[PDB]
Amino acid sequence: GIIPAQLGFLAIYNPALGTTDETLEDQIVYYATASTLSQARRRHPVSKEERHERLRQIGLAQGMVEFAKSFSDGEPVDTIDTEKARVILVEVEEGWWILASIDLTRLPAYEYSSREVKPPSLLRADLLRAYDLFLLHHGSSLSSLLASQGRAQLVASLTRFWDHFLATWNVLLHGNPACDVFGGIKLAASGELGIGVGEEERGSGEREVLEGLVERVEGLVDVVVGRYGGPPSEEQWLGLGGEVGEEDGAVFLGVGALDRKSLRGVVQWMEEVYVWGENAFGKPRRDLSTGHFLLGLSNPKAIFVELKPSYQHDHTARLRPVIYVSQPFIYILLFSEITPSPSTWPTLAESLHAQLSPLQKPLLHSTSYRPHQIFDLVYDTETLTLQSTIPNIPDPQSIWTRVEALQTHAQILAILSSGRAIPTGERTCKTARGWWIVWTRVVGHLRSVSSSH
Amino acid sequence: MEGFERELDNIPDTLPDDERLALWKGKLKHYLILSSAGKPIWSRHGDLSLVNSTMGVVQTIISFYEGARNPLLGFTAGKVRFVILIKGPLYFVAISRLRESDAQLRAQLEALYMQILSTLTLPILTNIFAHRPSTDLRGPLQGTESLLASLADSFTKGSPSTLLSALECLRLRKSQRQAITNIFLKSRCEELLYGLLVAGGKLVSVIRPRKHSLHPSDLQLIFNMLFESGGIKGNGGENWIPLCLPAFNNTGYLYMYVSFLDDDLTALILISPSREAFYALQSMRTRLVSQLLSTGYLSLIRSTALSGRPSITSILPKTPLLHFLYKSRPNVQWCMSSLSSLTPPGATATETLLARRKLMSVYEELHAALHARHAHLRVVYSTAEGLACLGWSTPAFEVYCVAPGCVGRAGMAREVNRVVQWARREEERLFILGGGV
Amino acid sequence: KKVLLKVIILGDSGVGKTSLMNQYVNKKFSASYKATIGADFLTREVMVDDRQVTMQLWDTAGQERFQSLGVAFYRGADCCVLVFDVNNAKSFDALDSWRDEFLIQASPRDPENFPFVVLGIKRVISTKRAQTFCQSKGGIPYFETNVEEAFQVIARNALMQE
């Protein structure tokens, strides 16, 4: 009879949208609850009382923000600790807020415990990552989205994207919380390919091939390739709705031409595609002609990115993504908006396959390279890259038991919260289970050693 | 360290309205005790005119959450933390800019509630707020406001006793403490229920009967109302305060007799369940006091209290530690090194206060790290020249220590083990293992 | 020394929305959370009889979404003020419902002479209809709006109750 922790409700609102009365309902550009989320969860009617509850919650959040403006001298309320729920209020951008109350676990009267629920930092990180993904698939910023497409279209897009995301969101601790809290770009175990001559084992010639693909192929702006899973063994590898492994991650980042924030967004979209193949946002259905290509250049689905200023190409791009998928590898190629015509896509696809298929074996060889038991996590703040070795939480044979995984990751998140290290000194904390967490600030890396017994 | 010198300075009433409001918002810490009706019952900083609208806002927020059947336990706004406790009709909210945990602020608010309940017994409070929810509690709390203000001032200054929920004791020899307790027993009265000898706010001796047990919560309440608040000096001499001691019996009134042992400020506390016992308790004190100077134990108590906490060098010869704070999980009692080592020998009140606040804030950060909910942390090391600090929470004790940053975890663990070994060696001479006969 | 009265002033859906309370209270001590929380928060001291009295004003929003949490704001209210507009016809017609809502929601101990001073903020509602409601129950001290002169009578009715 134990009710598991679930998202009590979530809402995205802009206080500047609702100024007078009978416009308060215009503030909530998105709202979702568990009863509402049930249909989306199965796939992926409101009344006056429910609207009253929604407006009351949004007004309560705004009231806390305004009441704490005086005490915090500008800082708004970000976390609310209640008996039966944990509330996170995140200002995604100027004037746009997302308020999410997550119901704690109910244990048979009820006893409300948050033993396995994500901490406020991780919930805020997940919400920010989802917002960044939404921006990646829609416009530059929520204010620009509204001012361009109208509140109705913004509501429709937000409803679709956030219903899809919240259907599969897990408020409990799962996967790799240590990697998730930082956001950033989760690099693979091998890291990056060899930068120059002499590192051909890591993929120096491979990186040169990718760069020559970027320069030679007309209309190609950027390329990011990441390894997710293993080599081919009925596999259905691209789905499984699972979790990104510790070894899985971005392999070769862009050649530039992409801001690190938007590069992180693209890498996170790659992870979402790997986890939710054919069910991820944009519906990346594999091409009928060949399974290597999904979400081809031929509904002009384009993702919105901000190019790096040191590029010819005020910086928003709206590039066109094409996903070439091999069994271990996913290449997301950002083409220019108009220079490669969709008419030539059948011809361009053959050349692209002929320039990536021979790359498969060398890429597999190079990404197999690797640089008591000690696990670390280097998060370079300047370049947003995250190289981690801490194992993810096993699903309900890894070197971890699940209980130890939850305890260790909750501890690690506790040090990150105490150390003020999350983006949104040395802290060495031990325990009675033989775990020795050592967080260090490298001068901008933030290493988290996780020494084990 | 961001304006703490004037934080304890009260807001002048001669300043105009908006400057007063800005000063109030600029205070690092705020304590707001109110009713379920939103009436200002007590505020640490600023009168009720200053805090009235803010208290109404807090009350309506908590009442919003009560209506949703989901009680509010607090919320964070950047560096500021609001902690809300609901002790029936009374709502306590602590607003902290000093970066304390929810647990520590909740403990401080619980201590304030403990003092309020000691002023008036729990059934009386519940009845007066039930049969008349439109009740202004500032009437019966006329004398309690000063004690609450001083207790909150001690909390802001940094209260290790409240942080650890324990009490300090005089570093007395076991034989000497046993002799003092036996002298206490040799002068006992039937009406006497709880005997207590304190020196400079540090426990010396405890006397309890077989049936009734002196809960640590009662001792914390007594020390908070008398020594942490420092209101014991007020109306000096024989002090016959009606008491509650909710841990023992919150439905009745005990009576505590407080006397000064000036015949550093040694105090004698005698709690009896009868109001007419005072004169007899007076005859008790003169019987006890005459025994103490005759045997010389009162002079020994005064001499031991006059010297403060032992210096860190004397405790640990040639140690790199600047300070430490050892709490024993049994006996619920703590001890620490002298605070004079942190500050230069020639320092003003402001400099010593700042040093104490910095060290105490480090200690509460460490305590929060150890006692994080769903975090079984045993040892926590941090580097805030810098300043290294360690906290250890073995189920048998609890020790926090601070050293200069040029020590490292390797040597800091050695020093923590050293101070723990010293405390275990002097456990009989530092803590009240048992009460009186 | 100090006497406290938590005034609850019942704006009839925006009628009392700081139209007259703006120049009453010292605007420095204010919190315009009526739009979100459901009550404007004010505080003003008056000279009632040779000693000051503080009143914490709660200008209730009156929106339907806040009605379910009515007992939240109405706890321990020593004062109530039924405020309407002389021009608006529905302003006076909603006074009975507002008074019944207060009487049931918070249940004052002796609502027979409970403080119910009415402020006629400045017509459909004439003075005859203005004091008809007053004489209906208790001859409550209506005043047509000098606003402070309608609030020391509130204190004179409340301190005698205490």
Residue numbers in the entry:
A (entry chain B): 11 to 54, 92 to 155, 182 to 306, 312 to 376, 389 to 403, 426 to 483, 500 to 524, 544 to 571, ...
B (entry chain A): 195 to 457, 486 to 606, 612 to 664
C (entry chain C): 5 to 126, 134 to 156, 163 to 178, 182
What did the study's authors say about this model?
The tri-longin domain (TLD) RabGEF complexes represent a family of RabGEFs with a unique conserved structural core. In each complex, two subunits that contain three longin domains (LD1 to LD3) each form a heterodimer, which is required for catalytic activity toward the cognate Rab GTPases. We here report the cryo-EM structures of the Mon1-Ccz1 and Inturned-Fuzzy core complexes bound to their cognate GTPases Ypt7 and Rab23 in the nucleotide exchange transition states, revealing a conserved catalytic mechanism with distinct modes of substrate recognition. Thus, TLD RabGEFs rely on both conservation and variability in the switch 1 regions of their substrates to realize catalytic efficiency and specificity.
